[PDB]
Amino acid sequence: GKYNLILSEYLSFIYNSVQIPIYYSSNSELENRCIEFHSKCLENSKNGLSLRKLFVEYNDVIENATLLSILSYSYDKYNAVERKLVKYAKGKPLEADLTVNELDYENNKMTSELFPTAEEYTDSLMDPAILTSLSSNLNAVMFWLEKHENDVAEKLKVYKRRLDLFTIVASTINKYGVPRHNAKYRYEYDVMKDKPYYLVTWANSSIEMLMSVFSHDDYLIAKELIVLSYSNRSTLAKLVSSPMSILVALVDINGTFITNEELELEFSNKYVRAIVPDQTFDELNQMLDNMRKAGLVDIPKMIQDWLVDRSIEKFPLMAKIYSWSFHVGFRKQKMLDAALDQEMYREYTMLIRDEVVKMLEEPVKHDDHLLRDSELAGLLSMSSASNGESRQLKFGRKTIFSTKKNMHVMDDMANERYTPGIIPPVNVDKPIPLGRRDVPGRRTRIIFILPYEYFIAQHAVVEKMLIYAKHTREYAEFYSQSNQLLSYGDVTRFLSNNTMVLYTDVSQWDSSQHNTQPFRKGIIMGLDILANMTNDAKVLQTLNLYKQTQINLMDSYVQIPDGNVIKKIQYGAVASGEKQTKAANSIANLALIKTVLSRISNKHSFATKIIRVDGDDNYAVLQFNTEVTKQMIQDVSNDVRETYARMNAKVKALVSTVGIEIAKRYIAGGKIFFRAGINLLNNEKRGQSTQWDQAAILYSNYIVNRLRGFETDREFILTKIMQMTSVAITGSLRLFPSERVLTTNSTFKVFDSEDFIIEYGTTVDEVYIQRAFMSLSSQKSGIADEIAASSTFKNYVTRLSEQLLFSKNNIVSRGIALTEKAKLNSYAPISLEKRRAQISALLTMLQKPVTFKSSKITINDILRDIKPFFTVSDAHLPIQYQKFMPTLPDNVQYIIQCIGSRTYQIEDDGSKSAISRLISKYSVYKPSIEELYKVISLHENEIQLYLISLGIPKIDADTYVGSKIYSRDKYRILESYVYNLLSINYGCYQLFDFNSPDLEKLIRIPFKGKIPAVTFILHLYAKLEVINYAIKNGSWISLFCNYPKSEMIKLWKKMWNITSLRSPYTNANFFQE
RNA sequence: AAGCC
């Protein structure tokens, strides 16, 4: 409950010249007491009188009522920041070295010197793009420094390391003053022109870095990155994190985890000798020297010290540095520069063509319905993103403009213009609009924003391709329900003294122009083979249309802004934006590795233990008939690099016998590692989410980094949350939501009261609040209702429905209309109306929590019912599993050591149910987990009608509605829905093996009947309760269940009426991946 | 005013 205490200290620290705590209670008499107390406090404040007597008087309210919020009456003028900063601003400011960056605009020049006029200005290259100010971040850092001013021992050292660093940020900022933000949290030209262009983004990156500093090493790293970053805005992250690829190869393997036949992690005490050719050492040295020529000193020395022995025990430092470099900020170049960088492919094209054929052979020969109704599938799938141009659109009686894809398809259909048979050109006549993608350390990449003709023509086919991958192991990213742990396991499996791993980063090749000819031609050749496999008109046309998109793309043109102009240039490289981006890219990368390996063997004889393509990297494990030597590694490597070289591909190809390093993960010393480089106080791009959504995201970001190895002080994260979640009533009246409002599992949840532990209402007041918040979950939108009433809209919904089903509509029809009414949320005007409605409802709710007819059941109510029937008892579980993911915090790591981990994702969509499969065989429709859940619980007769209404034949519908499988599905769908409501696949839980035998002993559940749903919930609730206790206490407990039989029948009814909750916290997990 | 997932 320390969040509430922390908030007051911060408010008291920020404002000095009152605070009015607002309480509430589920009990009527107590609530009046809360009402009386609130009234007295306002009256006393409106008279400059002490509130000390009132607190004593309403001691009961403070003691038993629940704090709902805090009122902030501050009569200053959002200043203080300027005044506060000077005490810390004593060190000498920093001076930008305007000679470190190639492109002139990447150097820290004075804003004016880059944009002499207010019309030439743009924040596009330094916009933090986040809904929180620089001034607030500064305020947060100072507040923390004051609190830990009188600290001692080691805590003091942490403060001292931080105070030093913040001084650099302060001193430099003061020389120009603090950049003031506008309503939309942007930094305009007038504020900007006096100060160094990159001032604000740099301060945000530095503050974020320094507040994540604890050990002396963190301090050394933060200081170097902070100083270097101010001048270097283009190669510092790449230079800092580049030695990692060499390093993984060095460390020896002394016992690691592998994958067994059951596709699960299993410990293997084996030893693998890290074999490294002298050449590799020179390459590593060149990297270290390069870091050195760039001003770096402390960071290069640390790698050098580590290099004497190369102990996986002192490796955490190397990992720490790699995670750290990403926090310098994003590299945001100019669209044109990002764009500008851009006979023996016979084997490579053939493999791509053959791979394309396998993924569709069976679907095509049979005459799969999804291929036949491909157009329909694309329409249902259609998002609400950009189509490219901002068209003028008339709805009902309203003339408005939008770039949205959904809006464009509807308007075009209502005007006979909708024509997916004609795949628009993307050449010089119709240049492709461009989108961008920014990432720290690496260079900016462009994105094709193609017209919806392309998405529809590609959506059915890509989906078939994905399914083929789903059961193909070479495709790491798509195989089964597999998580990264299984991939880590596979590489280790075959590592021995007579095998060498081959990892290669092919990100550069995908964007190469050399690549585009063999790529499109390979898919097209494959498409032709597929066409000669059937005669189906629907299959050929859908298949043909896909062929057309590849041909149009072969020669595309792009609209690259060059100031305030839009130069049209000829783009001959494969950018991404298509539906087939990831699947096609996966096919090409895999095709490429196979091509290289095939060429190399003519020389050396090895065995292909495993081959893989995972995103922008691909790798293989080879086995030789003899023992591997340093000389052998150099020879295999030179030949592989040379093979890549002949194909004119710029790629990083390395060879080791112990580790690998790819964009997603890296395996050093038999242990798995994941870069913790998610930026906190700077975003890639601006979206349409709110401050609350953003606060939840920052917390989520904090949780992922913390798990991965980078920890930002929680008090700082909490401070950020208080600023972001606040709401202004007026100009001097600010309202700050309480801990209870913020953490309770509601539609307004932003973070968990305790990291890695999700709590659910177990008290009446919590329940009262939870019910009240839901009462105002969805708000109305006038603009949205209008269009929901417009002809063009209803016809679009009607047109889709009359094409999908045969018999009758409504459970399906009601759903299609909403799904569409939702896609209007991308349209700002509608989104804006919703936020305004939410704030007013929220302001009133915090003020005096309303009523509610409840009558709605959720996950929390079901849990609350169970709790009282469990008897806890101290138990003990020994640690039996060695650590494979070294960076995990100590409490999370302990759960894994005792119960183990998993290598899969728990089915939380219900796609593995027979009914979902049946719908798939005959319908292009895709019911959600929630829809399936409502449908399975319907009366036998209703289910039969719904299946038929979707095109399912009678013999099949009739057979299922009675069968054993239908009864079984019922349980499976509920299990899937329940797992989904409990976030068993996210955060910390996704790691734990919930079916651990060790975990199972701790649960003692005697059967007093035999009714699946009830047995499953009790066991799950017990596993979660035991694990949460373990996470917080480091010790275990045994749970006994004495749940009545009369009770279970009541509970089972309760279960088939659970409502799903939507919230920033919920959105944040979805947002992560 | 920012495509696949």
UniProtKB/Swiss-Prot annotation:
Belongs to the reoviridae RNA-directed RNA polymerase family. One of its GO terms (cellular component) is virion component. It is found in: Virion. RNA-directed RNA polymerase that is involved in both transcription and genome replication. Together with VP3 capping enzyme, forms an enzyme complex positioned near the channels situated at each of the five-fold vertices of the core. Following infection, the outermost layer of the virus is lost, leaving a double-layered particle (DLP) made up of the core and VP6 shell. VP1 then catalyzes the transcription of fully conservative plus-strand genomic RNAs that are extruded through the DLP's channels into the cytoplasm where they function as mRNAs for translation of viral proteins. Keywords: Magnesium, Nucleotide-binding, Nucleotidyltransferase, RNA-binding, RNA-directed RNA polymerase, Transferase, Viral RNA replication, Virion. This is RNA-directed RNA polymerase. PROSITE patterns: RDRP_DSRNA_REO (PS50523). Its EC number is 2.7.7.48. One of its GO terms (biological process) is viral genome replication. One of its GO terms (molecular function) is nucleotide binding. Its cofactor is Mg(2+). Pfam families: RdRP_4 (PF02123), Rotavirus_VP1 (PF12289). Residues 486-672 form the RdRp catalytic domain. InterPro entries: DNA/RNA_pol_sf (IPR043502), RNA-dir_pol_4-hel_dom (IPR042032), RNA-dir_pol_luteovirus (IPR001795), RNA-dir_pol_reovirus (IPR007097), Rotavirus_VP1_C (IPR022071). It comes from the Viruses. It catalyses: RNA(n) + a ribonucleoside 5'-triphosphate = RNA(n+1) + diphosphate. The lineage of its organism: Viruses, Riboviria, Orthornavirae, Duplornaviricota, Resentoviricetes. Interacts with VP3 (Potential). Interacts with VP2; this interaction activates VP1. Interacts with NSP5; this interaction is probably necessary for the formation of functional virus factories. Interacts with NSP2; this interaction is weak.
